[PDB]
């Protein structure tokens, strides 16, 4: 729960922090040796691990899909494939901050959860903000270039870390937009299966 | 792990026997030269293992380190063992052992590491004929 | 899947399949070289995080091969469609390095009719096999040159006689 | 981008020479215009 917590926040659960597909990471709430207050701090940290397990499951599942053997992106195809390649790179400092926690707990044998809470309360904000960016794409079956608009309407975010983190994703998938445009504007041929780039 | 390393040991013993057998007078003019061109490739295989042994004297060598080091020798002795068995199995003397080497030069054309070994053996074996 | 790759690509039927099989071992040795050079003794999670951006590509290579499988011009064009298929992602240079050496004997077969005119066939991987004299039966790459190769060879094979 | 230029550029330079040499071989040697 000092190493099991870094392991469960790494996305590998364990039967203290019981992974449930409904309740994400869930402490099992009845313990005679710890007590209800640290349980609440553990639940508060398990929100981040729940979001991370759902993010990694979405990235593993919907790479758009694997070698692509009906397609729409994340059901098969390229623009949301650029979205997930942006998404794991955006989630990278959370991994590296966890690895830095591991070295500090390697150095000192007794560090608090309030120590971990203060170090990870900057990702405690960024994760629920990008959850809605993924959720609109899943719900409205957002096909092709409308993902570009969907991340841009939240690139007017007003948490400045959230604005910059979504800007990185927009630059990445603008990469594949510029890639298709440098084919049709330059060599005269479209290169699009079932996704589009605003020219029929 | 040593079971994975032992193929270069097995692909060495079948090369030294080929050079020891086909250096006899009955094997013509060209199969002499084919067993002639392989021994400069035997020299490098020994030199690596002596250098690794002198490195092992300092204790700065591991079993994983050795398995990393011997990767080119595992390929080069394998091509020599393939040529050795291909000359032995189908009896190849004179012009017949000059055809098979020209075939293996066409088998390896895009690697440029096994091609150069095989192309060196072709020009060296083509000297008496 | 690494063990499932060495079981599948160990042999040195088709010649372009041999070329593709020998190109795969040019990559698997790099996979064995990047491993076991960096970490003497590292943390557990460092291993799972380090081999994540690389290992999923190794699982992608299972769906490319079997672990049926075409041969000839069929395989050389299937691997081509696999390129534009997944172009802009990180699987462009590995598939491109496989295609660059999987076409290497086929370019010799093409390089016969342009330079020498000696038609070379082993098992039928060439799309073309062998008074009137013009019964070399003919019937992906651009078709603007495909029919042209067929007459560019037969002109040389007529001038030899 | 998949531009097949490394194949057809050392090839189309030779195709035209072969075909021009063949038609010229017919005309100035075997008198196809005379038949």
DSSP string, A133-192: HHHHHHHTT--TTHHHHHHHHHTT-SSHHHHHHHHHHHHHHHHHHHHHHHHHTTTS----
Q: How far apart are CA B111 and CA B72, in angstroms?
A: 13
CA B44 to chain centroid: 10
DSSP class of residue B44 equals H
Q: How far apart are CA C34 and CA A198, in angstroms?
A: 42
- Measured CA distances, C131 to B20, C134, D29, D30 (Å): 58, 9, 21, 18
Are the C-beta atoms of residues A148 and A171 closer than 8 Å to each other?
no
Q: Identify the closest residue of chain C to A59 by CA–CA distance.
A: C56
Q: How far apart are CA C113 and CA C136, in angstroms?
A: 13
In DSSP terms, which residues pair with A18 in a beta bridge?
A26
Are the C-beta atoms of residues A45 and A9 closer than 8 Å to each other?
yes
In DSSP terms, which residues pair with A26 in a beta bridge?
A18
Q: What is residue A2's three-state secondary structure?
A: coil
Q: What is residue B5's three-state secondary structure?
A: helix
Q: E strand or H helix at A20, and its extent?
A: strand A17-20
Distance from CA of C44 to the nearest CA of D (A): 40
**Minimal CA–CA distance to A169: which of A126, A118, A105, A110?**
A126
Q: How far apart are CA C18 and CA C106, in angstroms?
A: 12
Partners of chain A (3+ Cβ pairs below 8 A) = C, D
The residue assigned the tokens 């079997």 is: C66
Cβ-based contacts of A176 with chain C (< 8 Å): 88
Tell me the residue length of chain D.
Answer: 35
Name, in order, each residue with C-beta under 8 angstroms of B37's C-beta and a sequence gap of 6 or more. Answer: B120, B121, B124, B125
Tell me the residue length of chain C.
Answer: 161
Residue C42: φ, ψ to 5°: -115, 180
Query: Which segments of A10-68 does DSSP mark as H helices, in order?
Result: 36-61
The residue assigned the tokens 């790759």 is: C5
Interface check C155 vs D, CB under 8 A: yes
Partners of chain B (3+ Cβ pairs below 8 A) = C
Resolution (angstroms) equals 16.1
Are the C-beta atoms of residues B98 and B34 closer than 8 Å to each other?
no
Interface check D2 vs A, CB under 8 A: no
**Chain C contact residues (CB < 8 Å to A):** 43, 45-46, 48-49, 60, 63-64, 82, 84-90
Query: Angle A82-A83-A85 (CA atoms, 0-180°, nearest 5)?
Result: 65
Are the C-beta atoms of residues A6 and A103 closer than 8 Å to each other?
no
Residue C105: φ, ψ to 5°: -75, -30
| Experimental determination technique | cryo-EM
- Measured CA distances, C73 to C76, C82, C142, C160 (Å): 5, 14, 13, 28
Residue-wise DSSP of A82-146: HHHHHHHHHHHHHHHHHHHHHHHHHH-S---HHHHHHHHTTHHHHHHHHHHHHHHHHHTT--TTH
Name, in order, each residue with C-beta under 8 angstroms of C28's C-beta and a sequence gap of 6 or more. Answer: C2, C5, C6, C9
- Measured CA distances, C35 to B75, C54, C94, C125 (Å): 19, 11, 17, 37
Are the C-beta atoms of residues C98 and C20 closer than 8 Å to each other?
yes
Q: How far apart are CA A3 and CA A5, in angstroms?
A: 5
Cβ-based contacts of C85 with chain A (< 8 Å): 67-68
């Amino acid at each position: 729960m000092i190493h099991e917590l870094l392991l469960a926040l790494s996305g590998y659960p364990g039967s203290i922090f019981t992974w449930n597909k409904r309740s994400g990471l869930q402490v099992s709430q009845d313990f005679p040796f710890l007590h209800p207050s640290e349980t609440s701090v553990l639940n508060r940290l398990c929100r981040l691990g729940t979001d991370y397990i759902r993010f990694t499951e979405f990235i593993e599942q919907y790479t758009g899909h694997v070698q692509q053997q009906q397609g729409q992106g994340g059901l098969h195809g390229i623009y949301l494939r650029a979205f997930c390649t942006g998404l794991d790179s955006v989630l990278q400092p959370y991994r590296q901050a966890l690895l830095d926690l591991e070295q500090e707990f390697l150095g000192d044998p007794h560090l608090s959860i309030s120590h971990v809470n203060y170090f990870l309360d900057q990702f405690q904000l960024l994760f629920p903000s990008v959850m809605v960016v993924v959720e609109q794409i899943k719900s409205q079956k957002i096909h092709g270039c409308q993902i570009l608009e969907t991340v841009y309407k939240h690139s007017c975010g007003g948490l400045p870390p959230v604005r910059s983190a979504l800007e990185k994703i927009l630059a990445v998938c603008h990469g594949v937009m510029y890639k298709q445009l440098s084919a049709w504007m330059l060599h005269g041929l479209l290169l699009d299966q079932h996704e589009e780039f605003f020219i029929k | 792990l040593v079971h994975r390393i032992l193929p270069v040991a097995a692909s060495y013993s079948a090369v030294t026997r080929f050079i020891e057998e086909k250096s006899s007078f009955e094997y013509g003019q060209v199969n002499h030269a084919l067993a002639a061109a392989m021994r400069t490739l035997v020299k490098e295989h020994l030199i690596l293992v002596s250098q690794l042994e002198q490195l092992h004297r300092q204790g700065l060598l591991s079993l994983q380190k050795l398995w990393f080091y011997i990767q080119p020798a595992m390929r080069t002795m394998d091509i020599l063992a393939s040529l050795a068995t291909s000359v032995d199995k189908g009896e190849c003397l004179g012009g017949s052992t000059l055809s098979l080497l020209h075939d293996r030069s066409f088998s390896y054309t895009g690697d440029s590491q096994a091609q150069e070994l095989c192309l060196y053996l072709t020009k060296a074996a083509s000297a008496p004929y | 899947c690494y063990t499932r790759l060495s079981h599948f690509s160990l042999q040195p039927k088709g010649l372009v399949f041999q070329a593709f099989t020998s190109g795969l071992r040019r990559y698997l040795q790099y996979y064995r070289a990047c491993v076991l050079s960096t970490p003497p003794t590292l943390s557990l999670l460092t291993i799972g995080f380090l081999f994540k951006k690389l290992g999923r590509q190794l699982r992608y290579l299972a769906e490319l091969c079997g672990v049926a499988f075409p041969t000839g011009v069929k395989l050389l064009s299937y691997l081509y469609q696999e390129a534009l298929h997944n172009c802009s992602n990180e699987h462009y240079p590995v598939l491109l390095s496989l295609l660059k050496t999987s076409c290497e004997p086929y370019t010799r077969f093409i390089h016969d009719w342009v330079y020498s005119g000696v038609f070379r066939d082993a098992y039928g991987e060439f799309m073309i096999q062998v008074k009137l004299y013009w019964t070399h039966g003919y019937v992906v790459f651009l078709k603007h040159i495909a029919h042209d190769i067929y007459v560019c060879g037969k002109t040389i094979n007529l001038l030899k006689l | 981008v998949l531009m097949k230029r490394s194949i057809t550029a050392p090839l189309a330079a030779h195709i035209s020479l072969v075909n021009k040499a063949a038609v010229d071989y017919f005309f100035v040697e075997l008198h196809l215009e005379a038949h």
